[PDB]
């Protein structure tokens, strides 16, 4: 039925945590009623201990498991109730949930819990193995987590695991807590932390979760904690992998309802005990105050407050819990005062005169705070505010029981743990600035503060005296004794609750959305207490699961966030769409409100000025409001401030604006509601800020984003940039600072400066060294860029930033962040922005960023590349990139219409036998094909064919083949692909294709020179790779095989423009020069992808512009839908994890039933996608949907198997292929997805060129790679890409295909640009030059400069170079700036081959070949690599050196190194027979030097670097050889 | 200025200096015909309006080309920004000419600077600026070179172009009174000139390399003789912090402050 709105405002609770549900209370046992005056005062006895059980006694340190005994030193006995429970702790995974009273020890319990999973995983030959495992510690209170992580360190320290606070600044400090177990941390930070995904890369190693002091549920904080559990409860269920939850919480009721939440079985789970069991029993005061009249009552309470404390004025001790800073010591002093009005009565405290140590009290005398006052007398102050030190020094002195009265705050009794015989809490209310007004105090916070109450050794009994109003007499009864309901704040923060589970993917629609809020702590008591929680019975008996209530909640929700843009959800489909908006909301745990307030105010023209009022104007300030009696300080405030509020007059505007102000402009505050007021602001005003940022960098407004970020920092550092960037350094003093600050002297001009320099400024040398060491500290980045243009469009980047400060990570730490971006002419627009990290290994370390930015009509004067540290502040290096030379490419002419033409038939060619092998396939050929027939077919000369991969081109290649085929019976044939991969996949496909039905004979040609030349001559048809034809062919000259080709074949020659691509352009021009020589035409017939600057290319290859086809993308057979997805998560891992969800989206919406391809960035995440597919297909309650037979036809497949997790995979229809495959096993998996009994075939990437089996729908997962060899990631080559996505295609059936690209933010609209339009295509010949030009002297085609410059002619490069010269570094496009460019080039081409000796240049004109460049010529080497040898073969050398020798050849460079590689070799190049002096082992040549020598020892290892191995073997003999000439 | 509250009202006053960019106002009047016409393109314009105050005259050096094959308009195609400060009715920015590499592919067309009341006339204190350049720069000609003066009409900008005549050119030279009203000025000593808007194409900016160009803040830290360097940026607008060290660095204060409210909640990271 459809959902109705309905207002979640009376539907909350307001005053939470104070909400006292039930409105009955109880009395103790022996508790009377004595009301006086004005007040009335009731009283409670001590409980009574429960009498021990037949045979039940107490657990020593001896008798529980051996290991988990270490680390309990100096305690003896086990507590009664860790003794109960110890049992179920250690031996079950069942879920705990204990609730005892204050006092009972729970920490030790829960401790067991972790000493169990961190008895789990455990060695014999080491211990406690830590990267198996890590432990989430949730505790309710700062001061607690920071103690407890103190005190569990040195506790866990005899096993040596690491815990550790959760403080960090998720990007800095998530590879530091990367190493960190059992971390501990409070459950907002867990909520934010995980709305991030930081949590997402620590997950599924982690089985143990703490929930400590859960009973915060109860709380306004509540749904925080209600939030995370639901989420782990609700994952658990995905993954069906399980975790421990262990719930600690005070004694109250509604025990069985949070045992439900918590997933605790009842029966053997459940654990309670009553108010009893407080091991220092408890005699409870409360005493409610009647009157009306504050005045009044600021007296009685006084009077209240003497009397009690003159009862405990003999021997005992007092503690008091003010609420206030300041009231610490103004509640002493009038107790003082009072005994000293009292004529000397109250005092001596003391045994006698000098009896009890009063010398104590007197010789501690000197100290920090105001206790030079009180210490004299009985009584001192303690807080966290006038001291550090002396509150440890004031803690010593209570301990030892030399001060009965201490007046304090409740983060004394969070804090470091002493108790009181008694304690005494005044008031109970305090000053919330969230809530705008003063409210009682928390549940946990007197909890807390009078679970102090009482010595566990010094005590008989413990008292505890609560004053406060009346009024909440009742409420604070129902806690300390267990009648108070625990009940769900989540209401209130519903729509935010689930905006945030939208922005993580686990909310896609209505439905689930149901789903999750049915794993709330709000579910089960809207189950169990429906007349509370605002449902009738009779409706609730009208819908028993409240299906219609969860539907109905949440659809308000939705509403909300659909009405502030955080979601766009329309009702028909009941469907979530997460908003960039929704995401920064959900990151920064902003409210909807704010967010929507943001929207509204924020644009690109925003001041300073007014960017301050946008902040102020933020929803989580509504409350604050501007009080008379401040009004006047305010006022003076204002006039002090330097940014501008005067838009607005005193309204809570100015008092949030100024206040901020005063923070950062480090300002003190006389009235005490604006302190705590300023710090409600100042401490929220991080996450506003930031959210405000990231908004505004998204949008791309440069300004604006500047001086968002510059306010970040001031609010993080609590300064104004004009003050000296020495400041964030603390380690400074003061008054150097402003000293410098005095004299005017730029921050960056102190690096010209040396020690003395310094010094000399502010005439303080003594100084002048110590400065210099944090000038230098100071992160500066020096950066370069060498900038070439792409199309008249776009121009590419390539930006080298150079470290220029000396790290230190007690400065600097583990990471430090910057943003680079490069904005438009004016500073106005920013074009583009990365998030650069330079980690702590690679400062020294120049890093490579290459990214494209588009140009504009009016070409602008230049660009600018800003780069900024994120946290740091007035830290900034700016990079003017000019225009004023830039010469842009010409406008590429349009794309040969595709005309309509009648489709050809295969009936077309009059051959019968040639129709034979078309026929039974398709009846008819492509718009393409049929446009190119008459061209490529009934006639003879060269072509070129550009269409995008997936447009049938190889039979096009096929028509010219029989064309020649007429021709002559003999007629010889060479076709050329640029992938080995590529060219095995033609080959298998042509000797049918010709060989069996034509009869002629097809070959493959290989690595050697002698069986590749006897190969040709006798095939018709030659298959070959660049580089088999260049070694061969090079000296053609001498082979009339080569000389007597009829058809030549170029294809994708578009490879040009990769690597490897000059041997390519070299072959096709030296054909070229052949044919010219022969005096007989050579046809060549060259096949592309869709080329913008297809003219250049037909221009070079010899093609009348008439037989040139060049086609646009969107001509294709079968169309395509191509949708791009971008990421904002800069680091990898986070990233691809959390485009594991999508895949399965991006399947089950674009192609539910279809074959689907997945491309991976590694070989192993082949595996775990494969996996995660798996595991999420469970989630839809469609399990093994992507199998289409029974698993009784896979029986045969599977018999062949070795990988035992791949039999799984391909049972539900997945599996998956990459390079450590048996070729079976592959062959398998190709024929189980081809036939279609499996829908979905995950794939390693490099698997992208060989693969013979196409699909419906393509998902490119995470574009870039790792590379060892400069540790950092690496994009996948564009042309890679289009063949990945050319792999959607299935002509046959569908009238579609479909591609989803997920790819990172920066590298998002770079797909958008290239993957439509036609592509550009450039030369490389420029750069790889020598080893030809070597090559061809040596055949005497290059006899003189002349021949040198003459042969550069017949190039691709030649071509270009007059194009788009910028590219070429060409600075001009006039004829003698070509001719200059092109001799410079012979010039240092043949200066540097002569200055290697492997030519002579005689007379500066002639050149000759000489021993060393004959040698490379003739066995196809690398020529730097024959003149390393050169420089290093000497008279003595020996097999040690010819190892390493030959293992820096040129050639073992392509050798690649994988993720961490760096530990593996080490742990190879241990055991093997010479070891080497000090190598790195992220460089290739040391890693073939280690394989090879593995090789001679005959050692077997992984078959990852075994291939490797394989590969180098295949090409050392020719090295070898090469030494001994 | 009052340095104090003088400060202030212009500060948030020129926050809105960007609502003025989208409405100006070009003199139109009678063409000489045998001049030069000057275009300029709109984008520089635009921010140069952004960076100024409504008080201080801020000025900027003109780098221009004439398009090939049409040797009577000159596009400027740059604008210098070198360090420099302003009165209401004046401003004073260094001996030093631009020197930089990618200056060297045009040529000096003169400057350009704001004029807080707008007045139909080219103030004496331009003209004897001018000329005094001129004067001791050769690289500037009398002919080529231009002084356009924009001005802030209500919620607008208006702008015109003036050359020097020779008359004009040779009191310049020889003017030492600043003031007002000097001896022996007369409008025979300039000429009005014609100037259009473009969208056509991108202009660019110069800035200084060391520092930015806004010393109104510091006066005593220029000097005539003074130095630059440059760059290729755009300029900081006139508040911007960097402009105003002196007031970012008042803080006097003890860290102690922060011993009172040490009650420290952050609970988030």
Redesign the interface.
């Known amino acids: 039925a459809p959902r109705q709105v309905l207002d979640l405002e009376d539907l909350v609770f307001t005053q939470g945590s104070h909400f006292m549900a039930n409105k009955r209370c109880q009395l103790p046992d022996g508790s009377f009623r004595r009301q006086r005056k004005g007040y009335e005062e009731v009283h409670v006895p001590a409980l009574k201990p429960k009498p021990f059980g037949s045979e039940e006694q107490l657990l020593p340190v001896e008798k529980l498991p051996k290991y988990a005994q270490a680390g309990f030193e100096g305690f003896k006995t086990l507590n009664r109730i860790q003794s109960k429970l110890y049992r179920a702790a250690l031996e079950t995974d069942e879920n705990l949930l204990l609730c005892a009273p204050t006092g009972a020890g729970k920490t030790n319990v829960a401790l067991m819990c972790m000493l169990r999973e961190i008895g789990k995983h455990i060695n014999m030959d080491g211990t406690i193995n830590v990267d198996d495992f890590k432990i989430i510690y949730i505790a309710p209170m700062?001061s607690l987590v920071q103690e407890m992580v103190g005190s569990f360190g040195k506790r866990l320290a005899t096993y040596g695991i690491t815990v550790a606070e959760?403080?960090?600044?998720?990007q800095l400090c998530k590879e530091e807590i990367s190493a960190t177990q059992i971390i501990v941390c409070?459950p907002?930070?867990w909520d934010?932390?995980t709305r991030k995904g930081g949590e997402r890369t620590y997950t599924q190693l982690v089985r143990l979760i703490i929930l400590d002091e859960i009973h915060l549920l109860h709380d306004d904080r509540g749904p925080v904690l209600e939030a995370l559990v639901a989420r782990a409860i609700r994952n658990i269920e995905m993954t069906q992998e399980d975790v421990r939850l262990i719930g600690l919480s005070a004694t109250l009721p509604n025990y069985e309802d949070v045992a439900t939440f918590l997933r605790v079985d009842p029966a053997k789970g459940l654990f309670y005990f009553d108010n009893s069991f407080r091991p220092v029993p408890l005699e409870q005061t409360y005493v409610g105050i009647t009157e009306k009249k504050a005045i009044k009552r600021f007296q009685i309470m006084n009077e209240i407050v003497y009397e009690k404390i003159m009862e405990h004025a003999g021997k005992n001790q007092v503690l008091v819990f003010v609420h206030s800073?300041?009231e610490t010591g103004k509640t002493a002093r009038a107790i003082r005062d009072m005994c000293l009005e009292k004529d000397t009565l109250g005092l001596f405290l003391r045994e006698g005169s000098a009896s009890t140590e009063v010398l104590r009290t007197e010789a501690e005398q000197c100290k920090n705070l105001e206790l030079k006052d009180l210490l004299p007398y009985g009584f001192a102050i303690h807080?966290?505010?006038?001291?550090r030190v002396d509150r440890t020094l004031v803690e010593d002195l209570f301990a030892d029981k030399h001060i009965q009265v201490l007046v304090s705050?409740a983060?004394l009794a969070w804090g470091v743990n002493l108790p009181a015989h008694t304690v005494i809490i005044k008031g109970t209310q305090v000053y919330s600035p969230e809530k705008g007004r003063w409210t009682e105090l928390g549940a946990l916070d007197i909890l807390q503060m009078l679970g102090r109450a009482g010595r566990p050794q010094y005590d008989t009994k413990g008292e505890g005296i609560l004053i406060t109003s009346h009024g909440e007499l009742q409420y604070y009864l129902s806690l300390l004794n267990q009648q108070l309901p625990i009940e769900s704040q989540m209401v209130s923060k519903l729509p935010d609750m689930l905006n945030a589970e939208i922005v993580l993917g686990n909310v896609q629609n209505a439905k689930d959305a149901v789903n999750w809020l049915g794993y709330a702590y709000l579910y089960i008591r809207m189950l169990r207490s429906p007349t509370l929680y605002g449902i009738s019975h009779d409706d609730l008996k009208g819908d028993p699961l409240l299906d219609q209530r969860r539907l109905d909640l949440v659809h308000t929700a939705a509403l909300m966030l659909d009405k502030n843009n955080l979601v766009k959800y329309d009702k028909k489909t009941g469907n979530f769409q997460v908003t960039e908006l929704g995401r920064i909301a959900s990151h920064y745990?902003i409210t909807n409100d704010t967010v929507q307030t943001y929207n509204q105010l924020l644009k690109p023209?925003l001041?300073?000025?007014?960017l301050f009022r946008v902040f102020s104007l933020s929803s989580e300030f509504k409350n604050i409001t501007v009080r008379e009696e401040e009004k006047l300080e305010l006022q003076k405030l204002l006039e002090r401030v330097?940014i501008?509020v005067?838009?607005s007059i005193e309204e809570p505007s100015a008092k949030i604006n100024v206040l901020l102000q005063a923070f950062i402009?480090?300002?003190?505050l006389e009235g005490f509601a604006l302190?705590?007021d300023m710090?409600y602001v100042t401490?929220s005003a991080?996450?506003l800020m930031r959210a405000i940022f990231e908004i505004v960098l998204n949008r791309g407004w440069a300004q604006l984003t500047d001086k968002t970020l510059?306010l970040c920092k001031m609010i993080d550092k609590r300064?104004?940039?004009?003050?000296?960037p020495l400041r964030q350094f603390r380690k400074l003093p003061?008054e150097v600072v402003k000293k410098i600050?005095k004299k005017?002297f730029?921050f960056?001009?102190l690096y010209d400066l040396n020690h003395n320099e310094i010094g000399e400024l502010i005439r303080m040398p003594k100084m002048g060294k110590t400065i210099h060491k944090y000038v230098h500290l100071f992160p500066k980045l020096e950066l370069s860029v060498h900038l070439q243009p792409i199309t008249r469009s776009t121009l590419k980047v390539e930006l080298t930033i150079t470290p220029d400060f000396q790290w230190d990570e007690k400065v600097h730490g583990s990471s430090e962040a910057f943003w680079i971006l490069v904005?438009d002419?004016?500073?106005?627009v920013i074009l583009h922005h990365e998030y650069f990290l330079l980690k702590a290994k690679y400062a020294q370390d120049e890093h490579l960023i290459t990214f494209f930015v588009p140009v504009?009509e009016?070409?602008?004067?230049?660009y600018?590349i800003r780069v900024v540290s994120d946290r740091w502040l007035s830290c900034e290096t700016?990079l003017?990139?000019?225009f004023?030379?830039l010469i842009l490419p010409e406008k590429y002419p349009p794309p040969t219409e595709l005309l309509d033409l009648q489709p050809l038939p295969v009936s077309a060619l009059r051959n019968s036998a040639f129709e034979s092998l078309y026929q039974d396939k398709f009846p008819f050929f492509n718009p393409i094909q049929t446009q190119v027939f008459n061209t490529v077919y009934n006639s003879d000369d060269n072509v070129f064919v550009g269409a995008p991969t997936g447009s049938g081109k190889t039979i096009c290649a096929e028509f010219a083949i029989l064309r020649m085929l007429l021709q002559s019976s003999e007629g010889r044939c060479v076709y050329i692909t640029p992938m080995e991969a590529l060219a095995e996949q033609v080959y298998m496909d042509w000797y049918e294709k010709f060989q069996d039905r034509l009869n002629k004979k097809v070959v493959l040609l290989t690595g050697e020179t002698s069986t590749d030349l006897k190969l040709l001559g006798k095939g018709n048809i030659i298959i070959s790779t660049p580089e088999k034809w260049d070694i061969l062919s090079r000296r053609w000259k001498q082979r009339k095989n080569v000389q007597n080709i009829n058809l030549f074949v170029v294809d994708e020659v578009h490879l040009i423009g990769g690597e490897n691509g000059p041997v390519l352009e070299v072959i096709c021009s030296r054909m070229r020069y052949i044919s010219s020589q022969i005096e007989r035409p050579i046809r060549i017939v060259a096949l592309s992808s869709s080329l913008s600057n297809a003219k250049d290319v037909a221009h070079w290859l010899g093609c009348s512009a008439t037989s040139t086809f060049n086609f646009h993308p969107n001509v294709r057979p079968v169309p395509l839908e191509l949708h791009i997805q971008g990421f904002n998560i800069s680091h990898t891992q986070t990233r691809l994890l959390s485009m594991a969800k999508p895949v399965y989206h991006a399947i089950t919406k674009h192609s539910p039933k279809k074959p689907v391809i997945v491309f991976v960035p590694s070989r192993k995440q082949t595996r775990l996608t494969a996996i995660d597919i798996l595991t999420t297909c469970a989630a839809d309650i469609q399990r093994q949907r992507f199998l289409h037979c029974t698993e009784k036809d896979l029986i045969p497949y599977l018999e062949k198997l070795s990988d035992s997790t791949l039999k799984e995979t391909l049972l539900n229809g997945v599996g998956y292929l990459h390079e450590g495959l048996s070729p079976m096993e592959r062959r398998l998996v190709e024929q189980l997805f081809s036939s279609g009994a499996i829908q979905v075939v995950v794939a390693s990437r490099s698997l992208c060129w060989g693969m013979n089996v196409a699909a419906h729908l393509v998902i490119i997962m995470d574009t870039q790679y790792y590379n060892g060899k400069i540790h950092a990631y690496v994009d996948y080559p564009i042309y890679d890409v289009l063949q990945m996505v050319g792999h959607a295609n299935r002509p046959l059936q569908d009238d579609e295909g479909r591609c989803v690209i997920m790819c990172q933010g920066s590298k998002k609209d770079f797909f958008k640009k290239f993957l439509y339009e036609p592509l550009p295509v450039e030369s490389h010949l420029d750069h790889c030059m020598h080893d030809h030009f070597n090559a061809e002297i040596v055949t005497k085609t290059i006899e003189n400069k002349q021949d040198a410059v003459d042969y550069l002619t017949w190039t691709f490069l030649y071509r270009r170079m007059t194009q788009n010269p910028n590219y070429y570094n060409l600075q001009g496009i006039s004829h003698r700036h070509l001719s200059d460019h092109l001799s410079e080039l012979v010039e240092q081409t043949l200066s540097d081959l002569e200055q290697s000796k492997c030519i002579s240049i005689e007379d500066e004109m002639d050149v000759a070949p000489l021993n060393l460049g004959m040698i490379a010529a003739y066995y196809y080497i690398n020529y730097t690599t024959i003149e390393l040898f050169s420089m290093s073969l000497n008279a003595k050398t020996k097999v040690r050196g010819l190892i390493e020798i030959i293992s820096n050849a040129a050639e073992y460079e392509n050798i690649p190194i994988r993720h961490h590689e760096d530990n593996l070799l080490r742990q190879l190049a241990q055991k093997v027979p010479h070891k080497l002096n000090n190598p790195k082992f992220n460089d290739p040549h040391v890693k073939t030097n280690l394989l090879l020598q593995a090789h001679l020892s005959r050692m077997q290892l992984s078959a990852e670097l075994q291939s490797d191995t394989e590969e180098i073997l295949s090409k050392a003999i020719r090295l070898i050889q090469a030494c001994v000439d | 200025f009052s340095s104090k509250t003088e400060w202030?009202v212009r500060?948030?006053s020129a926050?809105?200096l960007?609502l003025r960019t989208n409405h100006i106002y070009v003199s139109s009047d009678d063409i000489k015909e045998t001049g030069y016409t000057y275009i300029l393109?709109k984008?520089?314009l635009?921010?140069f309006i952004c960076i100024s105050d409504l008080r201080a005259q801020i000025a900027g050096y003109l780098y221009g080309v004439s398009p090939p094959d049409n040797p009577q308009v000159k596009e400027i195609?740059?604008i210098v920004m070198v360090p420099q400060w302003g009165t209401h009715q004046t401003v004073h920015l260094p001996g030093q000419l631009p020197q930089h590499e990618?200056l060297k592919?045009m040529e000096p067309l003169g400057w350009i600077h704001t004029q807080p009341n707008e007045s139909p006339q080219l103030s004496p204190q331009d003209v004897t600026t001018h000329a005094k350049i001129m004067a001791d720069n050769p690289s500037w000609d009398g002919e080529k070179t231009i002084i356009i003066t924009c001005s802030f009409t209500p919620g607008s900008c208006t702008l015109t172009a003036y050359k020097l005549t020779p008359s004009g050119y040779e009191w310049g030279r020889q003017n030492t009174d600043k003031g007002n009203n000097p001896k022996g000025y007369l409008p025979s000593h300039y000429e009005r000139v014609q100037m259009l808007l473009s969208?056509?194409?991108?202009?660019?900016?110069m800035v200084p390399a060391?520092?930015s160009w806004n010393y109104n803040f510091?006066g005593v830290?220029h000097d005539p003789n003074m130095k630059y360097e440059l760059?290729?940026?755009?300029p900081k607008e006139f508040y911007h912090?960097?402009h105003?060290?002196?007031?970012?660095?008042?803080?006097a204060?003890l860290?102690e402050?922060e011993?009172?409210?040490?009650?420290?909640?952050?609970?988030?990271?």
């Open positions: 700062r959760l403080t960090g600044d998720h409070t907002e930070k934010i932390i800073r300041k807080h966290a505010g006038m001291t705050t983060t745990y023209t001041s300073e000025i007014e330097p501008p005067k838009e402009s480090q300002l003190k302190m705590a710090v401490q991080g996450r510059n300064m104004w940039q004009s003050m000296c003061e600050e005017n730029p960056e001009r904005e002419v004016d500073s106005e504009f009016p070409l602008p004067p230049q600018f700016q003017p990139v000019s004023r030379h | 202030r500060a948030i926050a809105n960007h393109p984008n520089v635009k921010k195609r740059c990618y592919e969208d056509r194409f991108l202009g660019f900016f060391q520092s510091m830290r760059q290729l940026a755009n912090e960097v105003r060290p002196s007031h970012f660095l008042n803080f204060l860290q402050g011993v009172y409210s040490a009650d420290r909640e952050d609970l988030y990271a």
